[PDB]
Design a binder for this molecule. Structure first.
Ligand SMILES: [Cl-]
Ligand SMILES: [Cl-]
Length: 163
């Protein structure tokens, strides 16, 4: 584990992360997709061999020795708010299990279901709180990646508020 497990946020491409493994914001079919998923496909395409997995689950595929944890958040276009919320929390709990199983000391993670799966809603707080629920009991250093300056500030504030 990390000597003093922390949360941090960076405003940059998660495909350029400085952590021991990455979480993909995957689609259920293991397709190259859009946004984070497409960046992950360009950087670690070998990790999309048999990466298909249902909504609410995580499946890790190694690119060389570098683990890519494919986490499938719900598309809120398809799900009700209530069921979407349930599957989003579940995806993060599976991420925590995989991070634990891999024995990594750090992980790069995007906010699941906040992009084209958001159903046109701002889900920063919803997604981040489910990330914290799952990851708080892990001892990996977590680095959250975002692209928007206002999101970086809001995520940073949320991390600092817990101390
Ligand atoms: Cl998304
Ligand atoms: Cl963002």
């Amino acid at each position: 584990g990390a000597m003093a497990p922390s949360y941090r946020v960076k405003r940059m491409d998660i495909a350029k992360n400085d952590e021991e493994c990455v979480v993909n914001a995957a689609n259920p079919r293991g397709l190259p997709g859009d946004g984070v998923c497409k960046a992950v496909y360009k950087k670690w395409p070998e990790s999309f061999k048999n990466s298909a997995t249902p909504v609410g689950t995580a499946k890790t595929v190694m690119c060389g020795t570098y683990p890519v944890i494919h986490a499938v958040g719900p598309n809120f276009s398809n799900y009700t708010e209530s069921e979407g919320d349930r599957e989003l929390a579940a995806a993060y709990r599976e991420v925590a299990k995989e991070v634990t199983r891999l024995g990594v000391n750090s992980v790069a993670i995007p906010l699941l279901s906040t992009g084209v799966y958001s159903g046109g809603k701002d889900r920063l707080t919803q997604s981040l709180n489910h990330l914290f629920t799952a990851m708080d009991s892990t001892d990996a250093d977590v680095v959250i990646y975002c692209r928007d300056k206002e999101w970086e500030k809001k995520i940073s504030e949320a991390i600092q508020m817990r101390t």
